[PDB]
């Protein structure tokens, strides 16, 4: 009863998703403490959309979705409403009416590695932009020219995903950043996720 919302199990997770295959953790039927989210020394980014960060303790939601992935520092500026660029357009699109918060910190010490961490991926090509919260994990060879690719690579026929070159010597913007996006839902259903009742 009055089970705490598992925000620890997204912030404190050992390993994060590749942004093309972003992770989504659904949160319901819990009491939320947002105190862990305030006065944050580690968060290089904490911004909220359609709500004041103070008022998260005053509010209730039907569902909360904690989306999580790694991208470059340079690319964190794409994880917002009305944004464009490879990450916004082909990996993780937020809508223009988004209710939620976007949170990010540098993770060069978790997600870079001797001999490089080429294991985090981004989608380099798609035939259209993503709809908001669309998740494309297709490994279909991107045809860029008039000639059909028949499922193999070559001239104007390229793999749709590209590895991040997360070498430890990467400049600050080019280092890996862990990103957590808290989507806040409100609907017809009883608001199952509330702030502290005190």
């Amino acid at each position, epitope marked *: 009863i009055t089970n705490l919302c598992p925000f620890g199990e997204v912030f404190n997770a050992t390993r994060f998703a590749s942004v093309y295959a972003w992770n989504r953790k659904r949160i319901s039927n819990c009491v939320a403490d*947002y*105190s862990v989210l*305030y*006065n944050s020394a580690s968060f290089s980014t904490f*911004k*909220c*959309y*359609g*709500v*004041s*960060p*103070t*008022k998260l*303790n*005053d509010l209730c939601f039907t569902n909360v979705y904690a989306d999580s992935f790694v991208i470059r520092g340079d690319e964190v500026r794409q994880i917002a*409403p*009305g944004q464009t660029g490879k990450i916004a357009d082909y990996n993780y699109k937020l809508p*223009d*009416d988004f*209710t939620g918060c976007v949170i990010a910190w540098n993770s060069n010490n978790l997600d870079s590695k001797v001999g490089g961490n080429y294991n985090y991926l981004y989608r380099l090509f798609r035939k259209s932009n993503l709809k908001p919260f669309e998740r494309d994990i297709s490994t279909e060879i991107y045809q860029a020219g008039s000639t059909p690719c028949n499922g193999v690579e070559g001239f104007n026929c390229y793999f749709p995903l590209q590895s991040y070159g997360f070498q430890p010597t990467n400049g600050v913007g080019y280092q890996p950043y862990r990103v957590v996006v808290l989507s806040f839902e409100l609907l017809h259903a009883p608001a199952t996720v509330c702030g502290p009742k005190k």
Partner: antibody, heavy 119, light 109 residues
């Protein structure tokens, strides 16, 4: 509801000062509080917020230079200010924050206090 | 981070005139748009929140509308006490709440 600013005056470049704002005719500890500044010609700049949960916020024009605080036991708000530059010369207002559901606004402002940064 | 613009910059109108002021956000802000009134040597007063919701104890001659990028403040009939600078403010992106540069309304006496 009223808000009254204090501690405005003259300060030397590179210097430091602490602004003070007193609140009356509401339960102060129930409400978010803000500092907002007005230079003579450059418009309105939000410079800090303190919520109800000990929660503090600043723009990168202010990060580490100024520090907001509330003494609810005195119905009072402050801004500590350090490394003050000629371009910090402004009227500093304190403002109450309130919200019609999601929709957040600055419903009451004080009369403002003028800070002059010159040698 | 959502720069805010206003048009016109400066306006001159008679007592009785329907004055209409516009505000444009550099991104869509839905209805998260507030309007304020400031007079010389005074605190800014909140007139409107949520693009259109009038604040308690505001003269009913003040009204607001619009959604997405483009927003309006209409005074249905200007009065001598309405000599002011009027500012719009986005409340969509937080904590970095941005104000428009303002619009001054002079009275054509």
């Amino acid at each position: 509801v009223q808000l009254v600013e204090s501690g405005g005056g003259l300060v030397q470049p590179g210097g430091s000062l602490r602004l003070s704002c007193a609140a009356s005719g509401f339960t102060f500890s129930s409400y978010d509080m803000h500092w907002v500044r007005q230079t003579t010609g450059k418009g309105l700049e939000w410079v800090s917020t303190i919520g109800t949960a000990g929660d503090t916020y600043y723009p990168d024009s202010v990060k580490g230079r100024f520090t907001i605080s509330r003494e609810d036991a005195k119905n009072s708000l402050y801004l500590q200010m350090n490394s003050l530059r000629a371009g910090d010369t402004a009227v500093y207002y304190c403002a109450r924050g309130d919200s019609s559901g999601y929709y957040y606004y600055f419903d009451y402002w004080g009369q403002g206090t003028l800070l002059t940064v010159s040698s | 981070d959502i720069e805010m613009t206003q048009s016109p910059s400066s306006l001159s109108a008679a007592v009785g005139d329907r004055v209409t002021i516009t505000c444009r956000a550099s991104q869509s802000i839905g209805s998260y748009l507030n309007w304020y009134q400031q007079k010389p040597g005074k605190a800014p007063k909140l007139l409107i929140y949520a693009a259109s919701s009038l604040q308690s104890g505001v003269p009913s001659r003040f009204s607001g509308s619009g959604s997405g990028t483009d927003f309006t403040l209409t005074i249905s009939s200007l009065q001598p006490e309405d000599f002011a600078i009027y500012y719009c403010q986005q409340s969509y992106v937080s904590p970095t709440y941005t104000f428009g540069p303002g619009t001054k309304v002079d009275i054509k006496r």
